[model samples]
Target: RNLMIVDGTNLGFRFKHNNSKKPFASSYVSTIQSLAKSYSARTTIVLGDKGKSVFRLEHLPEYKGNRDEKYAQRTEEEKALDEQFFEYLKDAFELCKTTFPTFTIRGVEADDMAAYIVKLIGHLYDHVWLISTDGDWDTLLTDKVSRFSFTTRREYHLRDMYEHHNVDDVEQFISLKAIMGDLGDNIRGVEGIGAKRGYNIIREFGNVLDIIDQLPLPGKQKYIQNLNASEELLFRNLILVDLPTYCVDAIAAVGQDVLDKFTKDILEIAE
Candidate 1:
């Protein structure tokens, strides 16, 4: 069967706070299940677990630091609802296991989990659809994995990688992130550099180390200087930015049957 991986927490968080006038549906699980069933594909939803302390936040204090303040100010009622949603999320995943299978890990972002799972099963699956609005998942683009934006209805195939980013290597993609830094996640990329400048630097010099070595001073001097001072910090942030490709304990190991089983339960509850 074809496989579809959805970013549950990402989608749920989006849906919960969106200001659109659309009427509320049952839940994100049900919505995704209906879509998957229509396509006759098994689905898995990846959720983030901020509660887990195993994350590398100690190494990079700003790791998701931007979001902490926002999440802290949520309305009391909304906070209560979010708690309930998490409960539903657990129940939904368990139920999906009976039919679809699902997978998630604490302390690891959903993007990392998705990347590791896709890398593990790429050769075996007939087609893999990664469903998410987060562009970070762009790193998972490959011959085996396809990206679909549900809201936009735009699909990114292997060729689209070349069209958009000029390279298909996932590692190179992370390199791009390392240069560009992510404003959404509050990662300060090269201090004063912007996206266009970052892209030009990477395109011209190729890779972070080469850029640092050849960068001209006092012209594009600030970025070059920042790279020198924070190269180690930047690399460490890259590690935090890059997806965690390893398993988190036993339950979230990267295996086809395990992932398949994991997805099945989540979809069933979603249904």
Candidate 2:
């Protein structure tokens, strides 16, 4: 059976503000379930961000610091709503865990857990569908793994990744993000390398490390200097931006619990 995975945090946050005047906790849970059923999932798994990524914070002190302002300046009502929204999020995941395999690792964001799920269990199914609006998941695209976003009513597959970022494969997708960096995640890539320069550099030289090595023999002179100056930033960006490929050891410890859930409830379907 095909597997379906939900970005529980994504769904929870997206709906809480749909009618910010009213917090609809039940509707939020029902929406995720509706999508799972719509996809005809044989197995469903829910993934949520437990906390900030420790690896990210150790590397960059300001990993998601942009959210500081959002938290600081909210209205009294908005602050109350934020707590209300979180309660709704908790309720949604709690409901999901009773039947589906739900996972949340401390200090690991849902993004990596979702990506790790695809990395570990993707081959067993015919295809894997991840439901989230986060663009970072584009790096996980394959013929067998697709990302679905109901807000945009879109399903992104291989060509969709390429069309969005001019990336050819999963490796290139990670490389491209490393070169360009991601503002949403508060990650800064190479100093002067924006999308155009990032893509051309990756196309010509391949990956961030390789681009750093060959920065001298380059058409973009300032880019070379930027690469030279921010070599550390670029390297760390690679680690920070790329969807983890080295998480299999972590997955093994929790794999069977999820496997047991799958065996019991026939849970796989999507976001």
Candidate 3:
């Protein structure tokens, strides 16, 4: 009927700071089960971010580099808390693996795995459900593909782009991300370009790909100058941020044989 994909690492962090005494791993499995039943999904795939995206690192060594600084700045108590949370996250993955199809590749992010999964088998189901709080996953959204965010307690789909991202479509969402940059991930976008300006540019110039060729756009503003200078950065971000295309390529680059095997594994479970 439907396919459910869980962002295991993303959801694992939700319980990282919780005061609950019970082991979070059990609750994590229960939550996934509840979501599967709620969505009437017969098949579920759990994806975890095992390591920093390898391809992204090759594109920009500093990709997500700010997180290291933040981590280093964490207090002793916070560090211990994080350790316990990750320990339990591993346990959760182990527990879910017994029941659900789970994937955790060393150099690949769950985002890319989810993108590849959707690409491979999304159409076989009536609907595809992606569970994660990160807006980055919105890049995978389409008419058949939808996402549910625990943080927002809402579902996102093609028709509701304005309600969530303030953009008109997924293309615009990806463009906005590429232009404004994700501060959380430490990827720099055009200087002085925030959501408002990014959206305006997209509204006028189209998606990042469209805007790229037409760069050095007619304007005297500093932001426009910055935009003009951002050709290389934009291309790099597109490689880092354009999940559907770049992620697929990244996976294949690891080894087409590996990718083919992954495809077969997914098809086996999906069927």
The Cα local distance difference test for each model comes to 0.61, 0.72, 0.86
Q: Quantify how close model 2 is to the true structure by its C-alpha RMSD in Å.
A: 4.0
RMSD of 3: 1.5
TM-score of each: 0.74, 0.85, 0.95
Of 1 and 3, the candidate ranking higher by TM-score: 3
Clashing pairs for model 3 are none
Model 3 clash tally, residue pairs: 0
Model 1: per-residue Cα lDDT over 99-137, one tens digit each: 555555554557766665665554555777777777778
TM-score of 3: 0.95
Best candidate according to TM-score = 3
Model 2, which residues run further than 4 Å from truth? 248-271
Q: Which candidate would rank higher by lDDT, 2 or 3?
A: 3
Worst 10 residues of 3 by lDDT: 14-23
lDDT of 3 at 52: 77
Q: TM-score for model 1?
A: 0.74
